[PDB]
Design a protein around this ligand. Structure first.
Ligand SMILES: Nc1ncnc2c1ncn2[C@@H]1O[C@H](COP(=O)(O)OP(=O)(O)OP(=O)(O)O)[C@@H](O)[C@H]1O
Ligand SMILES: Nc1ncnc2c1ncn2[C@@H]1O[C@H](COP(=O)(O)OP(=O)(O)O)[C@@H](O)[C@H]1O
Ligand SMILES: Nc1ncnc2c1ncn2[C@@H]1O[C@H](COP(=O)(O)OP(=O)(O)O)[C@@H](O)[C@H]1O
Ligand SMILES: [Mg+2]
Ligand SMILES: [Mg+2]
Ligand SMILES: [Zn+2]
Ligand SMILES: [Zn+2]
Ligand SMILES: [Zn+2]
Lengths: 594, 39, 607, 594, 39
């Protein structure tokens, strides 16, 4: 029962070796392995379309039967490396093949990863949520039998079972040096939260990483991994075995349609100056007033541009706004607008996400008693937006943890013997009612809620809205409210209300969402004129600081710079403008001065 | 063919997605003062 | 692939026939003499240099490194075999174990073929401990570099001890006695836990089937010293974007008690797995300890040092993006070099910073921690603790002559305020979780940072009226600098201009002297630590003259300016610190004057 | 669970190669394998004692541990042949080791081959009785799977069972050329019949032969085999795997003691003239008269000298005597004298051995329904004697086969497609009373018995003994009869008889047996004087043939040649004496002329 | 440990010679007109 020859494997290995034999051709893969040898790694990367071009049949054979074809491929790779250099091949017991390129049907998402893809290559794109600790997995254990003076081996691979006795019950001692071990980490991927329906459920897919692939991933990373989707031994559980991992850019881009780009460019070139004000009016038209707040919310969505210095600095471009006001004010309604409006947002309560909370947390599995580093709500909002309601009700641990992300944009955790430093750069829109309602304009904003004044320093902007009993103002709001009440769709007969379905001038939210996404790609830079202008404005504000919100400081200066940068995005200007700084200056003056 | 015990070979085991749900009688369809049935 | 018996003879040849010319060129069998000591019970730990094996067989060294555990057993049994040869004296029966060993040998000799079970374990014919020492060729390996690939191999690493457990006796070979047949039963132990034996496998009870139930005997069994520790990556090893990673290390036998938390040690030993099952078994790893050691330019560089504005240029290089505060930047530089600790003197320079939020304070500490060769950052754990049963050192201990940057200093717990008081007093941390005042040598300089409560500082309100710290503790600091947000439209505009340039360039405006690379700065610091400038007694006359002058100013001041002998001693630290910057082993009048200038400015900051 | 290295086997394999590396030493084994390469065989022969000389320990290990040690040795042999010549080694899949030399205690007989020698080398000595047909045995079957385009193997070695379907149930078509087959034969050994106590049961041991060892044996061959004694899977059947077989000469040698040789030499030198008659009188002392018969019987035991000629003519040295005579004459008594005295004799009746009969036969086993060529009584008496009683009652097929063995001393057989030709050279001493008693001294002895007129020609001598009713003769016989009957042993009181045993001048029978055993080795040769003398006598018998027993013929001439040869052996005279021819001539005259 | 079926390994299965016999009561010792027993 000993297999002698596999002609299919023989030919398939030769076909790869011919493909790897890149000397008659441009040398791209021959150079890659040469660079790989210089790199001293043992995992070549491969574009599938090259294989398709050189042999469509072989590439189809590979994708339809990932396992055996890769084994032939790794055979060819090791042989090819040994051809170029035997001793370097002898350094490593094996080599590995990383796939890359286009996959028509096999490029899917965890939502769309069907069971049909079992045993096929698949390029799953998604977001990391959970990561396990790095552990050394034993694959091949060498044992020695002094009684027989005999060496025995065993391979586990996909296959209590750890042998310790000879068949004659001689003791066996494990040659730890000769035995083969490899670091091995497990992570979980989910669909990108922006592009996922609320009706459906999560589709979490488990990924296995080995060797160099182990720590090329962290929780809250947007990645695509190519691997072999497989079942597990026993109704069965299914996991993906990674063949190559890459962290795609989290910014991505607004592809959409060129029609959207043309409409955006047409609208932008229509009135570039009024686009900021027009968007603000159409940002939250269901709520009358708070127009400066709407301007700031727009600034938050567009945000600034991060500056990183020679000293490893990461001077943030994000903007953080806090809103305080008595209950029964549209604060909650504002957040619903932002969630519907923002390109990449995520809501959360004062409690935070269940268990994990705002930032990440370490959770044992409790199914096998296994530690897992779970990303929190804040981490998933990286390079996005987070909306926090009942921000006053934040827990004390979270009240401390918010400091790091607000300052550095990165959360760290060394607890439970588990070491991680995750990215959480996220412009945050927080809101909190005053305690006992009934805000008083005599105490600090902190004293009405309690924030320690570190958070208030951290927040770029703070806006206070009060339930003033002005009959004129209340008439304006109430008349607006009743106008929304009286409003009926053009197609309707004033009769029945909308059906109870199971599913869930003024510009559209979607088009606005498209435009801000396009604007977010824009990278407005500074102008010497505006830089001079704002510097005078800041020093003027320092002069205004003589009068006795927080005093103006260098925090406020950088807040203005991001605000002008955000307005620079709003008009799509490739540089900031005096209009941008001027709009920011009046906005800040409105915030600190009523 | 060891007798009954066998080893599964998941490589060739073909599987499909799988989901269990619970359905209940609509609130109108239940009798008065009766528990809706579940399937 | 190789007969261990053949390898056994080569090492025995090497042990019995390797020698090196000792002091006065004495041709001596270094290991052979130790073997003579070992046979006499004069030695227990037998450390083995691998480079000696490299002297005549580097191929054997690589084979040793390829599987360290195997060759360790080969070397141990070779020593077990050669001990009777080098035995010349019958030393007194040291401890029960020797006489118990001798009694065991006598009964064995009283017995002809014998089954493998009915023979003593080799690890019971012991009381000689064997270890290796890594070769000079194999460079010390960063902890993060050590992965599953290098398991089952000897390696050398360097790090900082985060924690060590107390010495405890780990069993080596459980010994039992049969209930009926009265035969001795042995059980070597590998895993950290095991199941005691019950029924005796001895031949007589085996035949008799008399229900001989083994009962353990501690005197029969053999134990060894054993403590557990977790080393941590050195600060230099970790890149700025990463964080340190721990490695459990199991010290045993003679190697125990050789380290304390915060000791910048270097360890050589075997990296092996411990099993405290998907596609193979997953098992925690550790590093079995063998050897432990507690560790401690171009001409143009010298021309740069000779520049009179050198230290000034270095001061400008401390957070150049932070516009202004250059005098403070100089003061930070003095802290980084520290004092001399001549004899002793407290060479640490603890500096406290107070001022309104938003004044680069937090940013300044971060740059210092980046620049510092060894440092810790905290907010306020800070102090040691006894976890449940191990001494876990706080960040204060982990400084260890580095610097413990402490942001949010005013909001520290008052208990910690008392703790740092001891640190500045005695450079030690006493902690008693169980009422046991365990003291740890926390030598380090403390760089504190705080803000006045209730917003910005109020000059009309006195010092400590805006800040909630003990005024005595403020006096303990070598320097105390105040920062006030005075609206100065021109200077504020200058700062605004600085910020806009950074936004438009991601770089500070071009200074008079460009900032230098942090590595170059640290190299200068390391050179400065080489120096220990002295204080000639002539300088004392001028020093005392200046001291009484400023003390008179304090008496003239309506508010006491904390002038005392503490103030004098700090001035001495600064002057010799400046002398280190000068690379001159004598403190100058210039150094004294500048220190007074900074002292005056710090006092002037209190305005 | 896959072995990597065996240090013991490594050393043992190395040591054998070192032993076979006979270059600096006397070169005997290097020359052997060079001869083996030239001779194209693949089974080296090895003296075990030389291995003891070079390595006593390894030789002890080899004898005590057979299967493992030989496998290492074959490995060393194959590499050693590959060293001298790679391509010749590559011709053969494997090579074999032949043991030889003195085996101290492992040299046993089938009686003494106890179960204690299991898995120990054994050097058995005995006689082959049952032989099975040559059959080819598969060892390594090679299969091809056109569905998978895959070739597999399956060894059997010591180990429904035949694989024909892929695990995917694809068909497998065998590859006959690629597969390995080896001829294979089974035989059975027994203790040498002369040295085999009647009380003990038969102890027959199976033997397995393979490769060139298959056909190097036949039934009725005195052979020494060296092999590994092993059990079989199931109270377990046990068989011996031959490592080398050699046919010891059936002559062997008269070991005895030098005292026996010296006593024989002194006795021979005492009186060479009367030694023939002194033996003859003391040959059958219980029997009275028939002196010529006793003289004739002695010549039969002594035997002539076989002459093998350049053309392959094989003039037999054996002598054949038939006794015809009335019942109640000491015929059956005379043969039991021969059985007690003959160095190598086998009794038999007219019917012969059960099933097999006198000559060989083919026998279905009926435990497996398997053919077995089984030796008969005639073949087992090769270079010996057979004593047939009731020879008249011999069956007709035996009356056919007797012609072959009498003519050629060689029984051929082709039944059931079993071609074989067994050596059966054996002097025969047949006895048969006349039919219906009361021989008529008028017709031929054939007319009284019915020997078909041919076997009388085949028989060299034919002696008639009739119960002549002479009162003087009866007195002589009855005097002899009562004298023996009245005898009591020297120590006895004329009281009790012998106990009921639970176990079975005048010269001792054993002394006679040892003496004639020594005499058989002597190879006396013709003298011209005797050759001239006998020619006169034979012509004289032809002259005396004028009167009219069978006529003197050329058969009679060679009969006298053997008789003179026999009497020459009696005196140990290596030259035939005129006395020898003289005594033969008168003896023949008595046979034909009363 | 396959279940009850196991593979015997004749290489190490040591054995010894084996023989059965039948013994009958003596004709003297049998009772009159009775069949001797066998063992
Ligand atoms: N003198 C200065 N020169 C340059 N940048 C400054 C200066 N003072 C403050 N900044 C800038 O202020 C920005 C935000 O304030 P910063 O981080 O310095 O606060 P902080 O003083 O650490 O406050 P706190 O201790 O209250 O948290 C920083 O990015 C820093 O660049
Ligand atoms: N300026 C406004 N214009 C329109 N509706 C408003 C306004 N202020 C408050 N509301 C009403 O308040 C309700 C939402 O209050 P909510 O934001 O949940 O209170 P809070 O956020 O203080 O808990 C909405 O139904 C909305 O109609
Ligand atoms: N010449 C003789 N001397 C002594 N006994 C004789 C002689 N002839 C015959 N007998 C007796 O004959 C008996 C054996 O006869 P047997 O040879 O069996 O008869 P047959 O061979 O004719 O069948 C013996 O008991 C023997 O005593
Ligand atoms: Mg609300
Ligand atoms: Mg008869
Ligand atoms: Zn089966
Ligand atoms: Zn017992
Ligand atoms: Zn089993």
């Amino acid at each position: 029962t000993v297999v002698l020859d596999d002609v299919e494997l023989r030919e398939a290995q030769r076909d790869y070796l011919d493909f790897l034999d890149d000397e008659e051709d441009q040398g791209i893969y021959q150079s890659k392995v040469r660079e790989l040898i210089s790199d001293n790694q043992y995992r070549l990367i491969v574009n599938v379309n090259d294989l398709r071009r050189k042999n469509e049949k072989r590439a189809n054979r590979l994708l339809n039967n990932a396992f055996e074809e890769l084994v032939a491929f790794q055979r060819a790779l090791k042989d090819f490396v040994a051809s170029i250099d035997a001793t370097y091949a002898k350094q490593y017991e094996e080599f590995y093949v990383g796939l890359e390129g286009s996959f028509g049907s096999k490029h899917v998402s965890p939502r769309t990863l069907t069971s049909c893809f079992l045993s096929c290559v698949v390029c799953v794109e998604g977001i990391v949520t959970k990561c396990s600790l790095v552990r050394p997995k034993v694959v091949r254990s060498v044992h020695y039998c002094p009684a027989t003076k005999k060496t025995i081996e065993r391979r586990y691979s996909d296959l209590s079972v750890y042998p310790t006795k000879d068949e004659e019950n001689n003791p066996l001692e494990t040659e730890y040096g000769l035995s083969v071990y490899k670091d091995h980490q497990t992570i979980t991927i989910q669909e990108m939260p922006e592009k996922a329906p609320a009706g459906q459920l999560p589709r979490s897919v488990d990924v296995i990483l080995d060797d160099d692939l182990v720590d090329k991933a962290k929780p809250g990373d947007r990645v695509q991994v190519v691997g072999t989707y497989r079942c597990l031994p026993g109704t069965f559980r299914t996991v993906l075995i990674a063949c190559n991992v890459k962290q795609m850019s989290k910014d991505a881009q607004p592809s959409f349609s060129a029609e959207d780009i043309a409409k955006i460019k047409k609208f932008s070139k229509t009135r570039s100056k009024d686009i900021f004000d027009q968007l603000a009016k159409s940002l939250a038209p269901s709520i009358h007033g708070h127009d400066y707040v709407k301007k700031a919310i727009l600034c938050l969505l567009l945000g600034g541009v991060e500056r990183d210095l020679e000293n490893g600095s990461h001077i943030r471009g994000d903007i953080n706004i806090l809103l305080i006001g008595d209950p029964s004010v549209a604060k909650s309604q504002l957040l619903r607008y932002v969630l519907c409006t923002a390109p990449r947002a995520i809501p959360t309560t004062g409690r935070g996400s269940s268990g994990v909370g705002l930032t990440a947390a370490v959770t044992t599995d409790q199914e096998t008693g296994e530690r897992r580093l779970e990303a929190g709500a804040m981490v998933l909002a990286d390079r996005g937006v987070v909306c926090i309601d009942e921000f006053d009700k934040m827990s004390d641990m979270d009240r401390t943890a918010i400091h790091e992300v607000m300052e550095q944009g990165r959360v760290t955790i060394a607890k439970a013997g588990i070491h991680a430093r995750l990215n959480a750069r996220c412009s945050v829109l927080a809101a909190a009612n005053p305690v006992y309602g009934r805000y008083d304009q005599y105490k600090t904003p902190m004293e009405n809620i309690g924030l320690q004044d570190s958070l208030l320093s951290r927040f770029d902007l703070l806006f206070i809205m009060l339930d003033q009993m002005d009959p004129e103002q209340d008439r304006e709001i109430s008349d607006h409210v009743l106008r929304m009440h009286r409003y009926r769709a053009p197609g309707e007969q004033d009769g029945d209300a909308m059906p109870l379905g199971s599913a869930v001038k003024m510009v559209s939210a979607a088009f606005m969402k498209k435009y801000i996404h396009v604007a977010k790609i824009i990278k407005p830079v500074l102008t010497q004129e505006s830089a001079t202008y704002i510097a005078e404005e800041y020093s003027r504000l320092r002069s205004q600081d003589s009068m006795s919100t927080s005093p103006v400081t260098a925090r406020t200066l950088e807040t203005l710079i991001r605000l002008a940068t955000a307005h620079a995005k709003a008009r799509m200007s490739k540089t900031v403008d005096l209009q941008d700084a001027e709009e920011a200056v009046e906005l800040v003056q409105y915030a600190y001065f009523k | 063919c060891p007798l009954d015990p066998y080893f599964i070979m998941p490589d060739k085991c073909k599987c499909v997605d799988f989901q269990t749900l619970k359905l209940q009688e609509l609130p109108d369809a239940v009798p008065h003062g009766e528990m809706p049935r579940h399937m | 692939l190789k007969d261990y018996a053949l390898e056994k003879e080569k090492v025995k040849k090497f042990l019995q026939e390797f020698y090196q010319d000792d002091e006065l060129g004495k041709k001596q069998f270094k290991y052979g003499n130790q073997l003579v000591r070992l046979a006499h019970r004069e030695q227990v730990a037998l450390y083995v240099d691998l480079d000696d094996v490299a002297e005549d067989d580097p191929e054997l060294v690589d084979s040793i490194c390829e599987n360290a555990r195997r060759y360790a057993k080969l070397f141990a049994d070779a020593v077990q075999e050669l001990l009777p040869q080098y035995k010349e004296r019958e030393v007194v029966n040291k401890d029960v174990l020797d006489v118990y060993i001798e009694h065991r040998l006598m009964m064995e000799q009283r017995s002809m073929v014998r089954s493998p079970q009915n023979q003593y374990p080799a690890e019971l014919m012991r009381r000689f401990e064997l270890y290796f020492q890594g070769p000079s060729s194999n460079k010390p390996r960063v902890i993060r570099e050590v992965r599953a690939d290098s398991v089952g191999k000897l390696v050398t690493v360097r790090g900082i001890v985060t924690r060590v457990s107390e010495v405890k006796p780990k069993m080596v070979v459980a010994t039992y006695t049969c209930d009926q047949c009265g035969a001795e039963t042995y059980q070597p132990i590998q895993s950290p836990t095991f199941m005691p034996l019950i029924m005796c496998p001895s031949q007589e009870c085996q035949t008799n089937r008399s229900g001989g139930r083994l009962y353990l005997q501690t005197r029969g069994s053999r134990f060894i010293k054993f403590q557990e520790m977790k080393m941590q990556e050195h600060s230099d090893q970790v890149p700025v974007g990463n964080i340190p990673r721990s490695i459990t290390v199991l010290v045993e036998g003679e190697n125990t008690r050789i380290a304390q938390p915060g000791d910048h040690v270097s360890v050589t030993g075997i990296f092996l797995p411990i099993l405290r099952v998907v596609q193979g078994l997953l098992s925690e790893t550790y590093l079995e300890a063998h050897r432990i050691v507690k560790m401690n330019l171009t001409r143009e560089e010298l021309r740069q040092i000779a520049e009179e504005d050198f230290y000034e240029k270095l001061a400008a290089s401390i957070a150049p993006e932070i516009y202004g505060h250059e005098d403070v930047k100089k003061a930070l530089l003095l802290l980084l070099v520290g004092g001399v600790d001549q004899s002793k003197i407290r060479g640490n320079i603890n500096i406290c910073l107070m001022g309104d939020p938003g004044v680069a304070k937090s940013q300044l500490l971060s740059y210092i921690d980046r620049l510092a060769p060894r440092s810790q950052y905290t907010t306020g754990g800070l102090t040691a603790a006894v976890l449940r049963l191990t001494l876990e050192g706080g960040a204060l201990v982990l400084a260890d002559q580095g610097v413990c940057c402490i942001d949010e200093f005013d909001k520290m717990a008052e208990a910690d305020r008392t703790a740092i008081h001891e640190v500045m007093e005695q450079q030690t941390i006493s902690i008693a979780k169980a009422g046991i005042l365990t003291t740890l040598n926390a030598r380090c300089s403390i760089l504190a940072a705080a803000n006045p409560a209730y917003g910005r500082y109020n000059p009309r309100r006195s010092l400590e009226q805006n800040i909630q710290l003990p005024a005595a503790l403020l006096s303990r600091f070598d320097l105390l600098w105040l920062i006030q947000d005075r609206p100065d439209r021109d200077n504020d505009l200058r700062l605004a201009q600085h910020i806009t340039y950074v936004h438009q360039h991601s770089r500070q405006p071009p200074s008079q002297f460009e900032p230098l690379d942090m590595k170059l700065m640290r190299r200068y610091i390391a050179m400065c630590r080489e120096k220990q400038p002295m204080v000639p007694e002539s300088l004392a006359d001028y020093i005392t003259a200046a001291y009484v002058e400023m003390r008179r100013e304090a008496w003239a001041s309506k508010d006491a300016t904390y002038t005392s002998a503490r103030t004098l001693l700090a001035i001495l630290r600064l002057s010799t610190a400046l002398a280190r910057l000068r690379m001159v082993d004598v403190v100058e009048k210039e150094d004294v004057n500048e220190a007074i200038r900074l002292m005056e400015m710090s006092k002037d900051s209190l305005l």
